[PDB]
Design an enzyme around this catalytic site. Structure first.
Site, PDB file in Angstrom:
ATOM      1  N   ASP A 172       1.410  13.686  16.564  1.00 59.28           N
ATOM      2  CA  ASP A 172       1.656  13.673  15.116  1.00 59.28           C
ATOM      3  C   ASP A 172       0.335  13.860  14.336  1.00 59.28           C
ATOM      4  O   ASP A 172       0.105  13.209  13.319  1.00 59.28           O
ATOM      5  CB  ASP A 172       2.476  12.443  14.668  1.00 59.28           C
ATOM      6  CG  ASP A 172       3.114  12.566  13.293  1.00 59.28           C
ATOM      7  OD1 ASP A 172       3.316  13.725  12.817  1.00 59.28           O
ATOM      8  OD2 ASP A 172       3.404  11.518  12.686  1.00 59.28           O
TER       9      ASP A 172
ATOM     10  N   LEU B 196       0.822  -1.211   0.000  1.00 59.45           N
ATOM     11  CA  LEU B 196       0.000   0.000   0.000  1.00 59.45           C
ATOM     12  C   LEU B 196       0.857   1.264   0.000  1.00 59.45           C
ATOM     13  O   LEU B 196       0.525   2.235  -0.672  1.00 59.45           O
ATOM     14  CB  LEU B 196      -0.963   0.021   1.198  1.00 59.45           C
ATOM     15  CG  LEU B 196      -2.013  -1.076   1.259  1.00 59.45           C
ATOM     16  CD1 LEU B 196      -2.787  -0.997   2.547  1.00 59.45           C
ATOM     17  CD2 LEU B 196      -2.966  -0.985   0.086  1.00 59.45           C
ATOM     18  N   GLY B 197       1.934   1.243   0.772  1.00 59.37           N
ATOM     19  CA  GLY B 197       2.856   2.363   0.904  1.00 59.37           C
ATOM     20  C   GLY B 197       4.065   2.029   1.748  1.00 59.37           C
ATOM     21  O   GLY B 197       4.186   0.915   2.267  1.00 59.37           O
ATOM     22  N   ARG B 198       4.974   3.002   1.870  1.00 53.29           N
ATOM     23  CA  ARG B 198       6.209   2.883   2.634  1.00 53.29           C
ATOM     24  C   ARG B 198       6.480   4.184   3.375  1.00 53.29           C
ATOM     25  O   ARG B 198       6.397   5.269   2.784  1.00 53.29           O
ATOM     26  CB  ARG B 198       7.386   2.513   1.709  1.00 53.29           C
ATOM     27  CG  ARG B 198       8.642   2.048   2.442  1.00 53.29           C
ATOM     28  CD  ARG B 198       9.703   1.561   1.473  1.00 53.29           C
ATOM     29  NE  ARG B 198      10.944   1.194   2.159  1.00 53.29           N
ATOM     30  CZ  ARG B 198      12.054   0.794   1.544  1.00 53.29           C
ATOM     31  NH1 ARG B 198      12.091   0.697   0.219  1.00 53.29           N
ATOM     32  NH2 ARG B 198      13.134   0.482   2.249  1.00 53.29           N
ATOM     33  N   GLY B 199       6.775   4.046   4.667  1.00 53.40           N
ATOM     34  CA  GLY B 199       7.103   5.131   5.583  1.00 53.40           C
ATOM     35  C   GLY B 199       8.570   5.103   5.970  1.00 53.40           C
ATOM     36  O   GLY B 199       9.367   4.417   5.325  1.00 53.40           O
ATOM     37  N   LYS B 200       8.945   5.822   7.040  1.00 51.67           N
ATOM     38  CA  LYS B 200      10.359   5.932   7.433  1.00 51.67           C
ATOM     39  C   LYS B 200      11.011   4.597   7.934  1.00 51.67           C
ATOM     40  O   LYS B 200      12.091   4.292   7.431  1.00 51.67           O
ATOM     41  CB  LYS B 200      10.585   7.131   8.376  1.00 51.67           C
ATOM     42  CG  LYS B 200      10.411   8.461   7.635  1.00 51.67           C
ATOM     43  CD  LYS B 200      11.059   9.654   8.331  1.00 51.67           C
ATOM     44  CE  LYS B 200      10.951  10.908   7.493  1.00 51.67           C
ATOM     45  NZ  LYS B 200      11.831  11.997   7.998  1.00 51.67           N
TER      46      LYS B 200
ATOM     47  N   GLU C  35       6.707  -0.568   6.264  1.00 51.94           N
ATOM     48  CA  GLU C  35       6.118  -0.944   4.975  1.00 51.94           C
ATOM     49  C   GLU C  35       4.704  -1.409   5.292  1.00 51.94           C
ATOM     50  O   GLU C  35       4.520  -2.230   6.197  1.00 51.94           O
ATOM     51  CB  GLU C  35       6.920  -2.057   4.285  1.00 51.94           C
ATOM     52  CG  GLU C  35       8.075  -1.532   3.455  1.00 51.94           C
ATOM     53  CD  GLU C  35       8.810  -2.554   2.608  1.00 51.94           C
ATOM     54  OE1 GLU C  35       8.154  -3.466   2.052  1.00 51.94           O
ATOM     55  OE2 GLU C  35      10.043  -2.403   2.453  1.00 51.94           O
ATOM     56  N   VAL C  36       3.711  -0.871   4.575  1.00 52.54           N
ATOM     57  CA  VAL C  36       2.298  -1.159   4.805  1.00 52.54           C
ATOM     58  C   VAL C  36       1.735  -2.021   3.670  1.00 52.54           C
ATOM     59  O   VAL C  36       1.922  -1.699   2.492  1.00 52.54           O
ATOM     60  CB  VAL C  36       1.498   0.147   5.057  1.00 52.54           C
ATOM     61  CG1 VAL C  36       0.066  -0.148   5.422  1.00 52.54           C
ATOM     62  CG2 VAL C  36       2.142   0.988   6.158  1.00 52.54           C
TER      63      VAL C  36
ATOM     64  N   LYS D 214       1.403  -3.661   8.982  1.00 50.84           N
ATOM     65  CA  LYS D 214       2.472  -2.668   9.014  1.00 50.84           C
ATOM     66  C   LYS D 214       3.714  -3.395   9.513  1.00 50.84           C
ATOM     67  O   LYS D 214       3.756  -3.821  10.667  1.00 50.84           O
ATOM     68  CB  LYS D 214       2.077  -1.509   9.945  1.00 50.84           C
ATOM     69  CG  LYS D 214       3.056  -0.345  10.020  1.00 50.84           C
ATOM     70  CD  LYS D 214       2.724   0.482  11.319  1.00 50.84           C
ATOM     71  CE  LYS D 214       3.282   1.895  11.430  1.00 50.84           C
ATOM     72  NZ  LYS D 214       2.666   2.673  12.574  1.00 50.84           N
TER      73      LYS D 214
END
Ligand code: AT8
Lengths: 317, 327
Positions: free
Chosen positions: A146, A43-47, A50-51, A66
């Protein structure tokens, strides 16, 4: 040194609870087998995450997995303890499971699936939905730290909202000095930018104010800083430098020398000037009065989530 | 032409579908830290090729447990470490915290989380029906997890279950006999402690699986609900099968050996005799009737079966009416 400060609401909620509630370092995390989940797509990638969209094989239900890059183990314990404490709360993302793949052993959090998809009414409605989540987590002794649009998921077809990414969240203890390297640049409260460590739930109300201003004025982000020092200058260009000095003097804050050549002198601006043909259908006296009561330098003078819910801006919801 | 093959009814191919790094423990590279970060406080106990100590982690002032292994078999130490690493963090599994060696002795040592084991005898006098259902469910969470991870414990017994009653916390310990399950693999039957050995081990049927742990769990349940320790009191491994046959009967033992074409050892000839199948109700007495119920007996009957394939798996056991009262 700096003058101490405390929250005007839910001040002692953690003080009156046994240490098991807030002592996340002592929390025993029990990681299930990730074999019960079949990863479908990225779905996406953060810091340090990985989702993935996944399916729970035991019940054929879609979930979100996640996969966390374990750069700091204490931080993972913190996020899990907070998610477990808040599990099932209004508009809080639901932690469904905590698992590890047998081979990789990488920490993974399993969440409810949210099918992430405007009028004056739509903004009041969703702002109230975020306030339900914030008043709840503040009542639970937790500051999100946040709050931003990327951390708010909306399924508009079902008029459903969820506050996500509890990775920066912390437990509020009166008199505690916290790390100011929190929130995302555009949503950082003045207290963080001036290195005032004894902050509270009011940090989240500043961030909510930054979100509201961007929506009603169609200006994303509202305070567009290029670095953390510049971020304070962008706020001062609207709130003025006079009230910034009154704030730092009230709390005996020592301004960083990096502000010397960039802060300048700025007048306090009126909210009405941000109204234009493209956004006038989203602006009203009530919206401006509510915004003015959220975006204040002095953390103690901002509306609490409970107070914000009683504002005339929400009389139609 | 030899015994009939058998395989697990659950988690059959979990290791077959994983890369060899997961289960090839002989190829696992162990890195041993400095034991200087731990100060030994007192001796807790002594096993066969191990000494267990309470210790203090000097970097954080926290109590830990240090197991110093007599390295008689290096392959076995690699096996225990790889299994502990694979299971680390799982429900009710003892947590391997560190792997170290004293600078001078160079003796292999495993560092674990500390468990405040409440004295069992005090617990035993006050145990209630609910407490037995609760703790039996806690053991099942650990077994369903390790079986799902392709691991058989092979030494389930009360000494390998630590309980902190005050905190209602339970841990399954001593993974030294545990093994990876591979379908069709013939295993050594010299595992588990006498009273807890399943019939498969006793008749030398090598192609066993996770269901061995469910027999051992059944032995523990029977000892707790009937207050008879141990339940099957053999004096040697052949006599151990006779004690089981005095309860389960000899008719169903012959059905089991015939189903798998097992050749009964001639040592059983003069000692096995003929025994009727006993009703579980016959073990109920004034001293244990408060721990027994129709549900407890139905559940026990479904674990203590000669036929390893016929026993409830851990996941099936968790769905039994005996646990309807637990969260
Ligand atoms: C209601 C509990 C129960 C239900 C069903 C069957 C058995 C039992 C049971 C009965 C007793 C015990 C206690 N076992 C403690 C064994 C133990 N204590 C230790 C302490 C130390 Cl310090 C060491 Cl080194 C090993 C240890 N092993 C565990 C259990 Cl699981």
């Amino acid at each position: 040194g700096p003058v101490p400060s405390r929250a005007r609401v839910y001040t002692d909620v953690n003080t009156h609870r046994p240490s098991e509630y807030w002592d996340y370092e002592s929390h025993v995390v029990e990681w299930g087998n990730q074999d019960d989940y079949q990863l479908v797509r990225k779905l996406g990638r953060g810091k340090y995450s990985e989702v993935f969209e996944a399916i729970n094989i035991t019940n054929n239900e879609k979930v979100v997995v996640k996969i966390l890059k374990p750069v700091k183990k204490k931080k993972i314990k913190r996020e899990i303890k907070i998610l477990e404490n808040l599990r099932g709360g209004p508009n809080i993302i639901t932690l469904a499971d905590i698992v590890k793949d047998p081979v990789s052993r990488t920490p993974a959090l399993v969440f409810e699936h949210v099918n992430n998809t405007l009028t004056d009414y739509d903004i009041r409605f969703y702002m109230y939905e975020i306030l339900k989540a914030l008043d709840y987590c503040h009542s639970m002794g937790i500051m999100h730290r946040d709050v931003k649009p990327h951390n708010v998921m909306i399924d508009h077809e079902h008029r459903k909202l969820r506050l996500i990414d509890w990775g920066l969240a912390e437990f509020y203890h009166p008199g505690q000095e916290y790390n100011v390297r929190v929130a995302s640049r555009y949503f950082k409260g003045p207290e963080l930018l001036v290195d005032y460590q004894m902050y509270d739930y009011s940090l989240d109300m500043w961030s909510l104010g930054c979100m509201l201003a961007s929506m009603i004025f169609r200006k994303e982000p509202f305070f567009h800083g290029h670095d953390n020092y510049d971020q304070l200058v962008r706020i001062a260009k609207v709130l003025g430098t006079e009230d910034l000095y009154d704030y730092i003097d009230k709390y005996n804050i020592e301004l960083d020398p990096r502000f010397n050549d960039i802060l300048g002198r700025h007048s306090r601006k009126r909210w009405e000037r941000f109204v234009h043909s493209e956004n006038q259908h989203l602006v009203s006296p009530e919206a401006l009065d509510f915004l003015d009561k959220l975006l204040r330098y002095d953390h103690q003078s901002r509306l609490t989530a409970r107070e914000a819910m009683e504002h005339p801006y929400f009389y139609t919801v």
